[PDB]
Structures are given as structure tokens and as C-alpha cells.
Design an enzyme around this catalytic site. Structure first.
Site, PDB file in Angstrom:
ATOM      1  N   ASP A   1      66.479   3.513  13.484  1.00 31.44           N
ATOM      2  CA  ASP A   1      65.168   4.139  13.348  1.00 31.44           C
ATOM      3  C   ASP A   1      64.710   4.217  11.890  1.00 31.44           C
ATOM      4  OD1 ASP A   1      66.541   6.544  12.347  1.00 31.44           O
ATOM      5  OD2 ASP A   1      66.316   7.490  14.293  1.00 31.44           O
TER       6      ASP A   1
ATOM      7  N   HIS B   1      64.598  -2.671  14.679  1.00 32.93           N
ATOM      8  CA  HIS B   1      64.182  -1.380  15.112  1.00 32.93           C
ATOM      9  C   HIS B   1      64.601  -1.038  16.552  1.00 32.93           C
ATOM     10  CE1 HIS B   1      62.044   2.339  15.258  1.00 32.93           C
ATOM     11  NE2 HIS B   1      61.422   2.132  14.112  1.00 32.93           N
TER      12      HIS B   1
END
Ligand code: CL
Ligand code: CL
Ligand code: CL
Ligand code: CL
EC number: 2.3.1.168
Lengths: 234, 234, 234, 131
Positions: free
Chosen positions: A208, A204
């Protein structure tokens, strides 16, 4: 009947290294369910043709090609990141790893350049990779340069999973067991539905939620509607 | 209506140290759903015998006994690893921890040597540990030596979870609520099925997916077909 | 057909730092399924009252209000923790963030003070933050001060997830796709149920499983039976 | 202005989508008298879609120096049996092939035909070798 102590030795040393490296990556988890009724139908009708060519045909070629098609639209998922995530290298080759466990556990050969291979070529290439890998005889070239990994936990059991990302990759998914479940159709009656779960993990730092999400729906829509795949193949 | 800031004091200190210690473990998650219908019925008939004997019979003794039976064949899940995963100790005793929260935070007593205890003894030891736990009267021996942990989040609610492995162990499983869902039987008809989800987390430095999966299958078959257990118990 | 290496720049560097500061948090995962059948119906009824007041109404304001009510009961979930987890700051305001992805990556605006807002004022605030968010004009004050986060992965797709906690917060939820599934009713007959999955991650250093599970349950009963919310609002 | 036969270049390396694109263009072009020399020359094989006006079977005329052509008729809904023995709505389209019998023999058109049809009757089989 008593406690035995032992060295983590020989090949098992590599799994330790890899999975420790994996702690530097904040894993984001995103899972879903995919309706494979069409695909199972599809596959039953393709087995006779592939058998007639000397090739067993699992679901994996389908999954692999769909991820490949998926990664064309979302190239970031087929990238690598550096020492502290300052630079991203976008990779041209969809070299997808098939996670395997042997007498020695974790080994991750990859099919090279899925982006230019036919479902049938990928079957062929998976068939080579199992012959070799269960023979303990997988070569170095088969093992390097992976860009993205799929793992079919469902070949054994399972619904959802949280797979571990394999540095320097930024993503992996796990496929669960295909299972007949009661599901509603457009008519609102209760059908038999061939249902599978998928769990994606992603780094992450640079990928996204919307990207995993969107990649996942596209991948999924290729499998629920295998005609969608026909449109852009050459 | 103002912000209050407070020391983390006393007993709450240890969860901080336990959970921070788990950051060094690369967690691989693997999940499934288990069909507990035959077990729900099985428990109904044993309930009066255990009530006659003075015990309350929940599902835990069965989960625990099925876990231990499972750990006989995957002894590496009942093991420990050192500071940097250099050396594994395989533990002979199955000292299975049961997680609880108390006013004072997380407490995890274990039932010793489940490998040599009947389901009924396990039931007894659970009540003992529960009483004590909630009375704040657990002894040191009740807490030390745990080799594997189960966590019944299902006593409160939930389906799937990501439980946190307790150093120095290598695996933990979380059990979710028993829920009646519609499912197919062999005749292709819609049934009432009692379905429970299970989530395992494993130290992927030394435990690979196949291991955790095959274990889950085995565990899972002992419970879906309870009488499987009956084969090797003495 | 070529590899390309690019730096992570500007507005992307921030996601790198946030997500990397989350690695110091031991994430506990807990998940459930919510029956949203009464809420969908309820929402249908209010839609032409919101459209007449200028407001698009989704499910989020209900999710926000039900989370805020949960948080009043379990204030430790709207709390922060220091550099190595030695003090807890319990936070008055329920500034709840809504996790968004922009053509700019990860942005997390919050609704200030949900505990003193009607579902309607929440809806109003969400709309506002969406106009601004999708036009890349969110102010600094919309951005700062969040105490707790919810993330609607399901506006895109998905069932369960492992959301990554945003420091210095201690918890986060992810909401999946509302999917019509066959489910049993009181009478034991097969119904169309509007099912949504929810997935919370929580800083296990200060938050035990009990509290995440009880909170979830409370949150979930506000949504499954929305009359319950009625009881306590002013 | 009569018979005009433009051709899609290199079908063997183009996707369905790509081919629909190139037809769209060839049509806009043709139906304005603006096809180039390049659009017009080099044809290896010809289809003829008489079914866009109507028809079942035909006897199309091979265009030298090519050796084959095919005509496609209307897609009509006809009663036909399924696997199980029941009467269904089937969409039946006729095809007619003409082939230069000097070098192409009967089995070849046949098997070719069967294959082509095979790929169409079972659109999934096309999946296997596309990339
Ligand atoms: Cl994380
Ligand atoms: Cl991890
Ligand atoms: Cl963790
Ligand atoms: Cl389900």
C-alpha cells in the site's frame, strides 16, 4: 533515408519478455526530494580513504545500505508475489539490483546480502560489478536472485522517473541527478542545497501507499541525517 | 440532479480504441527540467521577424527541431514495433505528431519530415495544422504516418505528466508550463530562471533508459544552448 | 535469516482485485504545483473556530470543496464507464473518497454529496470517518458509492505520485507535502512560498488532457486564491 | 563498595544502540550490587570515565591480566582554531592511556589512539566499515 526493418534479436529478446511480464503489475508511483548536502560532504571526506584502498566510492553504496536498512523495517518491499498474487514470499536476502545498460542494454546484476555488508563492502562489490558488466563479462550468479532494484538514472540526467518493476520483484526506485538548488534552512535564509529526486514504483496489489511512503521517509532520513545510520550498524 | 447514461459515440470511439491499444505497451517514464532562459530571450528577438513574415512563433518549432535533431542520433526512438515486438522498423522521416484536443476529442496531426525543415517552416506548418485542427478540416495525410509525438500540456498548465504512447510509435514527450524560478548561476547567485519540465514515456520492450536519457540530454542541450543547433543546420 | 511464504488472505484479497481491475484503464498522468501560502494563512485563522466547535480542521475539506466545484464544471471527471468503455454514466452526487491505509490495508471511505456541503460540514464528516477508520469500524455505507478520489500521500511525505484509479471511477488525485520553498512574487523578489504538488491520473479512454488540465487549473485557482470560492457558495 | 568493573561482551559484533542498552543494564545492576559472575569476568580491555565526575588527564591503573586502560576526562568548551584560521567553540575531551610496556610499545598506543580519535573526531569514518 528509407525505412529499414529488423528482428529484435539476440539479447534484446530478454528485455521484451521482462517488460511484457511487467504489465501484469499495477504500478503505484510515489516520488520525493531528498536533501543530500550532508551526504555530499560526507562522501568528499570518505573518497580519500576509499581511494587509499583501491575503491571508487559513488553515492550508490550509501543509497543501497539505506534501502537495506529501510527493507528491515518494511520487509514486504523485499518480497515476491505469485502467478495471480495469491501468495507472498518474504525474502531474507537483500539482494539489490543495480540497473545497468550495456552495448546490449538492460542488465541487472545485484549485490548479494546487503543486509550484512558494510558501506565499504558494497562499494567494493559495485566496483567488481562495473568492471565486469562493461566488459560484457558479468556471470550468471551475479544476475540471478535479485529481490529489489535501484536504478541511477541520474548518473546520466533526470529528475523524476516512472521505473518498471522487474518481476518477480514488487518494487524499484529511480534516483535522479544531484543538483544545487536554492533552499531555506532552519534560520529561514536561502542556502545552497544539494537536492536529489527519487521515484518509487510498487506493486499496488500487496504494497500500500503508506508502506511506500513510510519506507521512503525512513530511507530518506538515513541519507539526510547519515548519523541515523550509525546507530544500528555492527 | 439524476444520473445520466450515454453511448460513447462517433469520433469519441477512436480515443477508446487508441488508448486501449496502448495498454500493450510497457511505459518507462523519464522526466527532467530544462532551463529555457536563453530560449525565451531568443524567441523575443525572432518574434518581430516572424510577425513581419506573417507567422506566430511559439516554442514548439524549437522543441520540434530539437527533437528531430535528437532523433538523428537515437533513431530507435523514431521507430515502430509489431504485434508482439518481434520486429522493429526504423523510420527515416521525422513525422512528429502534435497532440490536440478538439470539441470532438483527441486529434494528432504531424508535421512531415522535420529533419529537412527549418524552424521557420515548422512554425508555418504548425499554424496550418492548428487552424485546420480547430476548423475540423485536417486531411487524412495530415493524420497518417506519425512517427513520434509531442504534447504541449503547457499551453494549459502543468509541470510533469505521464503521457500515453500512441501505437505504433515507441515514445511521446509532454511539455509543461514555462515558470520563472530562482536558481543558481555559475557565480553561485540566485537568478531569475525560466524553467520548463519535460516528461517522456517510452516502450521499454525496445527502448532502454540510457537511450531515453541521453536523447533527453541532447534535446535538452539544443534548447538550453540554442546555438548548438546552428552547428549542423544547412 | 529465512524465507517465508504466506498466503494473501481475507481483507487483503480485496486490494489484489481492485488494483488488478485497474489494469484495464489507460492512465494519463498530469501534475502541477500549487501555491498554498494564502490557504495556510487562511487555515490558521479558522483553526480556533473549529477547535471551538469540536472539529480538527486540516486542508482536506478545502481540497474536497475545490474538487467539487471543479467537478460541476467538468462533470465527465465524476463519471463511470462500462465493461469495455461503451457508455458513460455521469454521476450527480460528488461522493469523494479519501484514500486511507489501515493496519488492514487499503480502505477508501467517501464524503457523500460534497456539492451541498460547507467546508465545515466536510471537516465534520472527515473527522467522523477518521475516528471510525482508525478503529476499524467503518460502516458499509461509508464505503460504497464513491464517484471520485483524492488521496493525501502528503500526510506522510512525498512530492509527485502516480495514483492508481479505482474502478469504476475515472480519475484520482494525490496531494504531496506542503513544503516552504523559495519563489518569486509579483515584484520579482524572493519569497517564502508554501508549495504543494498535485498528481492526477485519468482514464484516457474518455478523458482528454485538456479536461484534466483545465480541471486542475480551476481546482488550483480555488486554492491559490480562496476568495474565488466565496463568489459562488450559498 | 569500591572498584567494580563489569564488561560489555563482544563489542566487536554489537551496534552502538546495543551497547547503550547493555550499559544501561550494567548500571542499573551495579548500582544495586547485583552484577553476576558473568557480567564481571572475562574483561579484555577497560575504559574509565572519570569525566562523569570531572578531570582532564589521568594515570589509570591497568587491571591484570589485561594490558591496557583508558581514562576519559571532562568535555569542556575551549577556544580552538578551525581550518580557516578563526577562533571557535570546540569541545575538547582529554584521554589518558596506560599500557603494559612489557609487550605494548609506544607507536602501537599512539596509532591506536589516533585511530580511536580519528573515528570520534570524524564520526562519519565509523560508517564505512559497520554493517
Ligand atoms: Cl496501472
Ligand atoms: Cl507499466
Ligand atoms: Cl498506460
Ligand atoms: Cl523547485
Amino acid at each position: 533515408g528509407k525505412d529499414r526493418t529488423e528482428p529484435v534479436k539476440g539479447f534484446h529478446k530478454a528485455m521484451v519478455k521482462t517488460m511484457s511480464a511487467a504489465l501484469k503489475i499495477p504500478h503505484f508511483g510515489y516520488c520525493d526530494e531528498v536533501d543530500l548536502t550532508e551526504l555530499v560532504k560526507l562522501r568528499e571526506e570518505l573518497k580519500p580513504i576509499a581511494f587509499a584502498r583501491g575503491i571508487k566510492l559513488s553515492f550508490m553504496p550509501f543509497f543501497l545500505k539505506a534501502a537495506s536498512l529501510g527493507l528491515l523495517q518494511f520487509p514486504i518491499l523485499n518480497a515476491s508475489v505469485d502467478e495471480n498474487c495469491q501468495n507472498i514470499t518474504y525474502k531474507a536476502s537483500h539482494n539489490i539490483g543495480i540497473a545497468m545498460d550495456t552495448e546490449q542494454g538492460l542488465i541487472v546484476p545485484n549485490v548479494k546480502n546487503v543486509q550484512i555488508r558494510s558501506i565499504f563492502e558494497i562499494a567494493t562489490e559495485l566496483n567488481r560489478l562495473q568492471k565486469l558488466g562493461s566488459a560484457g563479462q558479468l556471470s550468471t550468479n551475479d544476475l540471478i536472485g535479485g529481490t529489489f532494484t535501484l536504478s541511477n538514472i541520474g548518473s546520466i540526467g533526470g529528475t523524476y522517473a516512472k521505473p518498471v518493476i522487474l518481476p518477480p520483484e514488487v518494487a524499484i526506485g529511480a534516483l535522479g541527478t544531484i543538483k544545487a538548488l536554492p533552499r531555506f534552512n532552519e534560520k529561514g535564509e536561502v542556502c545552497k542545497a544539494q537536492i536529489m529526486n527519487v521515484s518509487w514504483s510498487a506493486d499496488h496489489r500487496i504494497i500500500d501507499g503508506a508502506t511506500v511512503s513510510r519506507f521512503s521517509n525512513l530511507w530518506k532520513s538515513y541519507l539526510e541525517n547519515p548519523a541515523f545510520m550509525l546507530l544500528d550498524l555492527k
